[PDB]
Design a protein around this ligand. Structure first.
Ligand code: AGS
Ligand code: CL
Length: 314
């Protein structure tokens, strides 16, 4: 009577039904759940996510050391939800946002709702209220850590409160997020759990481990920094995939850079040691020269984007 593959699928099906699609998956499964997404700003990360971007109506955690590139991704996500006509909100407990930098990443600052709460409770309630209006495509909360409880803020001499705070708010908010379809990005700067990163680990549909890995030099001097993101949790597509990309000083994710990495790995652009070539024409010697080439030769790149796009999904 026993036929494993048969029994297994019956079990997996039963599992998803009882707990939700994505409760169990084969790591190599080719996901076919289009959903609705907010492109990450990084083509590769969109691919790593398996669905083309951050899922809508879900809790997203983006953690890692400072200057890891978390905020950049958050800002790009906002920029993209806006181009699609979405409205964005920013719950700020850090007072670090640099609107001029955000504009550069394409964010329409003037339309950005910003709120600087007095307490963690207040910050999450304001977020809950904004979300339940169903009017937002995305909402980013700067600093899970910054969400300190009112009592602490007022000198209360008694603990476990800030994590409990993140739990209860997350319990209430997820419902509205799904109904509204608003993607909520919690930025968690570390020094995976910043007091309340505890409940966030379970409530999230996606958790991004962001980390700096290399300083982009090309020549002796610095041009920017390369970031590596690992999708440690993904309840909508097989997890653990990884992605890398360049964020040049004063710029967001380098599109050209992403086109040069995927293009090389997917054979569209050949790379003999030190020289990048594309179907019968030189791009230059050195990751950076190629970037320069693609920045200028806008016609190229678009086709390379085209090809890389078609090859996976546009
Ligand atoms: N205001 C800015 N002005 C110029 N460059 C910036 C600015 N913000 C970010 N960048 C660029 O992107 C990098 C920092 O990215 P962030 O997303 O701010 O890092 P992070 O991981 O979010 O660190 P935290 O704790 O949020 S600051 C910088 O090293 C620059 O390359
Ligand atoms: Cl994107």
């Amino acid at each position: 009577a026993p036929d494993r593959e048969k029994a297994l699928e019956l079990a997996m099906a039963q599992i998803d039904k009882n707990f939700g699609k994505g409760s169990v998956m084969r790591l190599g499964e080719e996901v076919r759940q289009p959903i609705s997404v907010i492109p990450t700003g990084s083509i590769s990360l969109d691919v790593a996510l398996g669905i083309g971007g951050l899922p809508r109506g879900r809790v997203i955690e983006i953690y890692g050391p400072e200057s890891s590139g978390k905020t950049t991704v958050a800002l790009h996500a906002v920029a993209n939800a806006q181009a699609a006509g979405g409205i964005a909100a920013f719950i700020d407990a850090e007072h670090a946002l640099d609107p001029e930098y955000a504009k550069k990443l394409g964010v329409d600052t003037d339309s950005l709702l910003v709120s600087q709460p007095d307490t963690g409770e207040q910050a999450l309630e304001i977020a809950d209220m904004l979300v339940r209006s169903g009017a937002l495509d995305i909402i980013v909360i700067d600093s899970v850590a910054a969400l300190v409880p009112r009592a602490e803020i007022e000198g209360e001499m008694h603990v476990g409160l800030q994590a409990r705070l993140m739990s209860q708010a997350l319990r209430k908010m997820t419902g509205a997020l799904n109904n509204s379809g608003t993607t909520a990005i919690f930025i968690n700067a570390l020094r995976e759990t910043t007091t309340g990163g505890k409940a966030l680990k379970f409530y999230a549909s996606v958790r991004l481990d962001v980390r700096r890995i290399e300083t982009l030099k090309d020549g002796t001097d610095a041009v920017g920094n390369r970031t590596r993101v690992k999708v440690v949790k993904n309840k909508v597509s097989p997890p653990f995939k990884q992605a890398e990309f360049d964020i040049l000083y004063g710029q967001g994710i380098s599109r050209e850079g992403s086109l040069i990495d995927m293009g090389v790995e997917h054979g569209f652009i050949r790379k003999s040691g030190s020289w990048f070539t594309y179907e019968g024409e030189q791009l230059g010697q050195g990751k950076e020269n190629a970037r320069k080439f693609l920045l200028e030769n806008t016609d190229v790149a678009n086709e390379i984007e085209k090809k890389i796009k078609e090859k996976l999904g546009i």
